[model samples]
Target: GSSSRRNAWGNLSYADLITRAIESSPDKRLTLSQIYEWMVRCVPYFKDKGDSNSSAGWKNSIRHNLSLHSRFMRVQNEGTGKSSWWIINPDGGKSGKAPRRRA
Candidate 1:
């Protein structure tokens, strides 16, 4: 699926934003910092907000989304002292839909 409407970038949910971030990676995966880099570089809404002044808000959302959703799977980086690589879960259901909330 192709999403050509750049203007809709801001309106996308955090899950969708993270999805796009992972999809753009060379290996179809990204670390948290790489995802943050993608959002800051690719999405205009986050361009000026990545600095310390405004980082807490959306950065937390990204962390929460990655943790709470089953769609994003974290795998070992296989090297010493490396963060887990986050990738899309093929069986995690539709990419655009949010998963059921935990009880």
Candidate 2:
């Protein structure tokens, strides 16, 4: 988050925070779960979010953003058979500016 009051989740939107997560990563990419960890690790509001390992409602949005945004491409994890990698598309996704809209 750009700013933190130490209580509120701050003003950073999910996309902004997600973008920061990927941009800050050494690989410039991150798994959805890693994104959650990154958010929790970086922001105070995300800490001690219970053991549900699910409060990350924001977590699922991470995946949704990947699917929604053309700039974010999902790549299979090879034999790992695990969560796919969410990477930035250099050419930009469909719209390149916003998540695709549903008609």
Candidate 3:
């Protein structure tokens, strides 16, 4: 039983997951690392794949989603060695269009 693996979370886009993670926070904001922590801790799909060796792709997707989408906003935190806190944009709709490659 210990050698089995499962498929990644399906049907949920990177934006959807990122939205859920950040919105669940007490301050409604989270660092990149905190977002990763939330996913593995709260999402069943990530539970077994949170380790460094298995998470690189999804983690990069999360970062890419945050950068490409208007729905997420990054704010500066006044502290030492802190990453920017991410938040949902109030005017930004819950789900935007997915990223499409050029023809």
Q: In order, what lDDT does every prediction score?
A: 0.68, 0.59, 0.65
Residue by residue across 1-103, what tens digits does model 1's lDDT show? 7766655578677777777777777876677778778767676656766765555678777777877656677666556656776667766433223345657
In model 1, which range of ten residues has the least summed lDDT? Answer: 91-100
Say which prediction, candidate 2 or candidate 3, comes out ahead on lDDT. Answer: 3
How does model 3 fare in lDDT?
Answer: 0.65
- Give the number of the best model, judged by lDDT: 1
Query: Better model by TM-score, 1 or 2?
Result: 1
Model 3 lDDT per residue over 2-103, tens place: 525534354456777776677667776778778778767666655555765556667777777877646677766656555677777766332223234457
lDDT of 2 at 62: 58
**Alpha-carbon shift of residue 6 in model 1 (angstroms):** 11
Q: Judged by TM-score relative to the true structure, which candidate is superior, 2 or 3?
A: 3
Clashes of 3: 0
Clashing pairs in 1: none
In model 2, the Cα lDDT at residue 36 comes to 67
TM-score of each: 0.66, 0.57, 0.65
Top candidate (TM-score): 1
